[PDB]
Write a protein that binds this DNA or RNA. Structure first.
Ligand SMILES: Nc1ncnc2c1ncn2[C@H]1C[C@H](O)[C@@H](COP(=O)(O)OP(=O)(O)OP(=O)(O)O)O1
Ligand code: SF4
Ligand SMILES: [Ca+2]
Length: 1123
DNA sequence: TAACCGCGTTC
DNA sequence: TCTTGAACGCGGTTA
């Protein structure tokens, strides 16, 4: 059926590609040098691989192959095709009677099967695969993917009919071919992934296409220079609505092509003609913009396509172009009966993203959200441009853009152009290098590299490794539709994750004194530990053995000259040293060190049957993780007893209009069971969820095939590279190479380059840890993720134990800790080496490191020495190191309003430089929140730097508080009408459409309903709507939820504006629309109030300063405490 | 009061 | 058909 339907595309695609100068090259025939040793003496064409897609090709049904797109050495492009049979495996019950399994499949699959061979693969779930026993399978090959699916169609029944009971007939009778089929395997490998992997081909790599196949020209250093072009469209829009593809037209289309810039004008909307101008925001981002003022909306769409057809771009960049730009251009093209596909080769795909054959479509927004490391309230185009490229792009109000078409066009023109310059340069300096480089190791084309989840990226990488060690791939994981425990149905099970702690709140500055009580037995402990830990510091930390220089004494003396003077005066009070320490790449290093991988986790049945179960098991490492389950207090009895009704069908047809318990699929059934089961639990239990913890043990086999571990290490290594250059470049020519009088921002450009790159790998890296819990994961282990976490806790806790005994740790999260230490503590030294240069030694860091190494070091790490003879060599492995952040000027931690309880994961930090070092958690950073608190927070944090003493510090702070108070107490009469509105608004996102919030109450929720009635049905068409709202004063004595009002009315017609304000306050006699009359200042007075107590006041108190802002008082407990 | 829920952060 | 994790904060309701 489909092979013709699917070869339509193939032929269509082939024509389009050819249109763009992608003619299907075929190489000369050669018999001789087949080895890649003499690559020149082999005929063919050298090309840089830019792209690859799955295709069907007729004889030269249809046969599955892969189109590969190249740029030649000469300039201009070409294409080539590898054909390669889709394939998968049948597993077998008893590995004896396999010819019999090959016999019946050969017969049963005559319709679709092409080829059949028995093969062997390693399989890490087989008893002694470590001793060379390989698992046997039948390899099923097809001429195409479609044929392969047909096979999976014909196998599923027997896979299911064999999973169910064989039902006898002669019940007195004192096997069949089919019943030996164990399972099916590697059947869902995306086809192009299959080729890319099997043939070892990767985009970004240089190949010569030859008769024999592809040869990586491993000699060509750097990538080619694809023609990139990045666009942005400007759109007409109603007041207070979103652009619509039916009613609305496209004002402008701005774009760039390798630094040459362009703008296309709809003259029917843009009144004035527009003149060639320039927008060069910084000097490194040149944008000359010649313009094409075009008569019709059509001539605009057609001047667009024509240019793209001319320049022939293999990359087309956009900012969120997938969900706005492209679908707008497409629908407005459908209007005029233009065919975008026929015109530029782009169409939707089965996920609604716009992709083309020849040209990758690189939606920078996907990078931004996945890989930028920016918070959600910075994933905006503006803020990205700010953060990433270091400048402010032209701003323009949305509701203005449609007006500014007529009135002020040159203004809007310059903005449209800015959207593009920010996109093109964002792409080139950040996206292009990352993705294209990443494709050289990941078997995906650039579009999927950019888009796939980071969990998937990990999977791909793990597949190449597993393939290349001939390891059979486990099937995707499947979750039980319900689990139980101690009789109780399970709600959710996980493991105890990270260990977080707030210890002390308040301001801590370098110029303000602090009181310390140094544990005496700790500095005794560390006095003993100084020799090894400093030999350590040189033997590993710099790995430079010992006595590289002489100072090993001129330093081991100087350290004690502070450690001794400390132990006697073990209660001092002076200036602080504010330090963060944080284990670099914790979970990955914890994993590599403990040789942690899903397959490395064995049971009783597993570890026993192993032929290394001899005397002196040095290969079974015992590690503890903490399981946690959430269940109903209903035991076996009640649980079982809630079998209950099973008789309320109540569901739909397509004449059906009737069902039963057992007529609803087990999903729907279990959904209903959810409801009923909740009732009996709370009714008899006095709770609706019990959560208990049990320490589990797990056996981490040290001998297992480390394809997973090794992959993690490889990716960590990949990353440390950039964390090397990042640290290098921080002092390389930023610290000591310039005099600050030589404007070399060049090093400042590199640091953002490498800081971004190193971060961009962070999430993929840690996704090697997360992955083992991902759904539809091929290598699932709760145990492993469990063990990794708890080990992390243990490591950080133990490190706190020491620090609290030797200073005051402020805050602590997972792998990192903040602490002030005494200002006369052994800081950082430079053990000097004879060979000229000097190393770096920070005693606090190296102090912890030795203890890590002397307490959590894998002494069981076995690795395979002699393949043929199965000889493992044990050795000692530990890659866990703390890293210091240098000493900071200040640090502010909020305190809770609840009593004793602190606030974790929020704080502000400042450099001796004076600049804001780090800011965490706060509403200022987060998307939405109350714009008041945000600007307050903006204003406030800096001001913790003013003031001469701790007491006097909170003063300059307290001023700002009162300032901001005098704006609320003054019922915002101190603030301009236009200005105020913004400052008072609170912006929230709904992540789902409004329909899917059935029976919940929230400001976002009702704002949505309100927008809905006011501006219309379309207003909640789709998910992700921003709810901009103020909370009204009336009705008095009514829940907050109810008084959420969209700020849109406050720019809408007065009749409508009244009818709704009156409606929304149950106040029909409402006549006053005064924006300030409706605003419930009393509420907004508490919120700003909470902020003050959180940041300023309760922290003030806990540091024994009298409340500095009495216009908001202590809670009854903070009062009832001072007594 | 305590248990929740949704967002959106920190790890 | 896509699909890393768990610990927190906070405003808000729910029982
Ligand atoms: N994005 C994440 N996904 C899954 N786990 C994460 C993620 N981020 C952090 N973690 C967990 C695993 C990390 O090892 C642990 C420590 O936090 P953090 O220090 O930010 O990561 P890291 O230690 O791996 O980075 P760095 O090496 O830069 O310190 O937090
Ligand atoms: S832990 Fe030791 S005995 Fe158990 S499977 Fe691994 S190598 Fe064999
Ligand atoms: Ca870390």
């Amino acid at each position: 059926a489909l092979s013709a339907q699917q070869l339509l595309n193939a032929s269509k695609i082939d024509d389009i590609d050819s249109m763009m100068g992608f003619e299907r090259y075929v190489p000369p025939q050669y018999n001789g040098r087949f080895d890649a040793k003499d690559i020149d003496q082999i005929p063919g064409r050298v090309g840089w691989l830019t792209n690859m897609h799955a295709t069907l090709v007729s004889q030269e049904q249809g046969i599955s192959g892969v189109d590969f797109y190249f740029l030649d050495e000469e300039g201009g492009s070409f294409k080539s095709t590898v054909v390669y049979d889709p394939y998968f495996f049948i597993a077998c019950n008893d590995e004896s009677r396999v010819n019999d399994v090959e016999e019946l499949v050969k017969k049963y699959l005559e319709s679709c099967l092409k080829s059949l061979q028995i093969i062997r693969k390693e399989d890490l779930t087989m008893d002694n695969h470590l001793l060379g026993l390989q698992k046997t399978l039948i390899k099923l090959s097809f001429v195409n993917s479609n044929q392969l699916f047909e096979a999976r169609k014909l196998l599923r029944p027997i896979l299911q009919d064999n999973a169910n009971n064989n039902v006898q007939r002669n019940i007195y009778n004192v096997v069949d071919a089919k019943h030996l089929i164990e399972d099916i395997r590697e059947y869902d490998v995306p086809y192009h992934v299959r080729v890319s992997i099997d043939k070892d081909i990767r985009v970004g790599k240089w190949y010569k296409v030859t008769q024999q196949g592809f040869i990586e020209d491993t000699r060509k250093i750097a990538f080619a220079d694809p023609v990139v072009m990045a666009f942005a469209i400007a759109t007409t829009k109603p007041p207070l609505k979103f652009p619509d593809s039916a009613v609305d037209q496209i004002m402008m289309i701005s774009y760039m092509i390798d630094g040459e810039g362009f703008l296309i004008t709809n003259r029917e909307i843009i009144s004035e003609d527009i003149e060639d101008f320039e927008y060069t925001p910084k000097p490194e981002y040149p944008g000359f913009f010649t313009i094409f003022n075009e008569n019709d909306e059509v001539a605009l769409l057609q001047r667009f396509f024509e240019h793209i057809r001319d320049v022939r771009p293999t990359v087309i960049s956009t900012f969120n172009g997938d969900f706005f730009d492209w679908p707008f251009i497409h629908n407005r093209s459908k209007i005029h009966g233009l065919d975008m596909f026929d015109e530029i080769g782009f169409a939707p795909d089965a996920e609604g993203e716009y992709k083309s054959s020849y040209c990758s479509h690189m939606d920078c927004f996907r990078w931004v959200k996945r890989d930028s490391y920016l918070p959600q309230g910075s994933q905006g185009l503006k803020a990205v441009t700010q953060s990433k490229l270091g400048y402010n792009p032209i701003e323009l109000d949305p509701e203005l853009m449609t007006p500014y078409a007529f009135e002020k066009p040159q203004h809007l023109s310059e903005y449209s152009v800015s959207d593009a310059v920010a996109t093109y340069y964002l792409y080139m300096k950040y996206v292009h290098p990352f993705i294209f480089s990443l494709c050289t190791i990941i078997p995906l084309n650039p579009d999927e590299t950019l888009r796939k989840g980071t969990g998937t990226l990990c999977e791909m990488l793990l597949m190449v490794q597993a393939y290349q060690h001939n390891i059979l791939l486990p099937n995707k994981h499947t979750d039980p539709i319900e689990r139980f425990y101690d009789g109780h149905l399970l709600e959710s099970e996980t493991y105890v994750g990270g260990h977080v702690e707030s210890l002390e709140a308040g301001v801590f500055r370098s110029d303000l004194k602090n009181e310390f009580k140094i544990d005496p037995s700790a500095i005794d402990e560390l006095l003993q530990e100084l020799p090894e830990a400093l030999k350590f510091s040189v033997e590993v930390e710099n790995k430079s053995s010992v006595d590289k220089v002489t100072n090993f004494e001129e330093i081991k003396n100087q350290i004690t000259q502070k450690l001794l003077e400390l132990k006697e005066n073990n209660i001092r009070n002076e200036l602080p040293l504010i330090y963060h320490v944080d284990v670099a790449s914790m979970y990955p290093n914890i994993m590599t060190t403990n040789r942690l991988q899903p397959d490395s986790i064995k049971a009783e049945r597993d570890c026993a049957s192993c032929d290394f179960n001899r005397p002196g098991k040095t290969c079974a490492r015992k590690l503890k993780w903490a399981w946690r389950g959430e269940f109903f207090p209903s035991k076996m009895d009640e649980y079982n007893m809630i079998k209950r009704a099973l008789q309320n069908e109540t569901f739909p047809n397509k004449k059906k209009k009737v069902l039963t318990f057992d007529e609803l699929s087990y999903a729907d059934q279990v959904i209903h069971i959810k409801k009923r089961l909740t009732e009996y639990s709370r009714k008899v239990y006095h709770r609706v969820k019990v959560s208990e913890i049990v320490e589990r043990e797990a056996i981490v086999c040290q001998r297992e095939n480390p394809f997973y571990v090794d992959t993690v290490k490889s990716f960590r290594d990949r990353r440390y590279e950039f964390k090397g250059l990042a640290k290098t470049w921080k002092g390389n020519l930023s610290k000591i190479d310039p005099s600050d009088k030589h404007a070399r921002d060049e090093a400042k450009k590199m640091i953002v380059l490498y800081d971004s790159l190193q971060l961009a790998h962070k999430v993929i890296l840690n996704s090697f840890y997360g992955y083992v819990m991902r759904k539809g994961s091929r290598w699932y282990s709760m145990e492993m993720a469990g063990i990794t976490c708890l080990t992390g806790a243990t490591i950080i806790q133990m490190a706190r134990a020491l620090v609290e005994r030797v200073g005051r740790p402020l805050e602590l999260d997972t792998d990192g800790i903040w602490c002030i230490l005494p200002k006369s503590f052994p800081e950082t030294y430079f053990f000097t080496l004879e060979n000229g240069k000097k190393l770096y030694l920070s005693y606090p860091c190296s102090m912890l490191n030795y203890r890590v190494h002397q307490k959590f070091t894998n002494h069981q790490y076995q690795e395979l020495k002699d393949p043929l003879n199965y000889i493992y060599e044990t050795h000692s492995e530990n890659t866990i190191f703390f890293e210091v952040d240098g000493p900071y000027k200040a640090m502010i931690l909020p305190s809770s309003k609840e009593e004793g309880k602190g606030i974790k994961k929020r704080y502000a930090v400042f450099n001796e430089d004076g600049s804001l070092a780090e800011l965490k958690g706060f509403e200022l950073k987060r998307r939405g929140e109350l714009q008041l608190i945000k600007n307050f927070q903006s204003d406030i944090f800096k001001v913790f730097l003013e003031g001469d003493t701790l007491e006097g510090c909170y003063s300059a702070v307290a001023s700002v508080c009162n300032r901001w108070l005098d704006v609320l107490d003054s019922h915002g009469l101190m603030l301009e009408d236009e200005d105020l509105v913004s400052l008072i608004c609170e912006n929230r996102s709904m992540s789902k459409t409004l329909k899917e919030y059935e029976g919940q109450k929230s400001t976002s929720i009702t704002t949505a309903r309100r927008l809905g009635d006011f501006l219309g049905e379309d207003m909640v068409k789709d998910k992700g709507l921003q709810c901009k709202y103020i909370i009204s004063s009336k009705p008095f004595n009514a829940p907050v939820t109810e008084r959420a009002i969209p700020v849109a009315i406050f720019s809408a017609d007065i009749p409508i504006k009244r009818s709704f304000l009156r409606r929304w306050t149950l106040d029909p006699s409402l006549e006053d629309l005064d924006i300030r009359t409706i605003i419930d200042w009393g509420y907004y007075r508490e919120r700003l109030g909470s902020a003050i107590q959180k940041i300023i006041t309760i922290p003030a108190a806990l540091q024994g300063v009298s409340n500095p802002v009495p216009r908001v008082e202590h809670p009854d407990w903070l009062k009832r405490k001072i007594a």
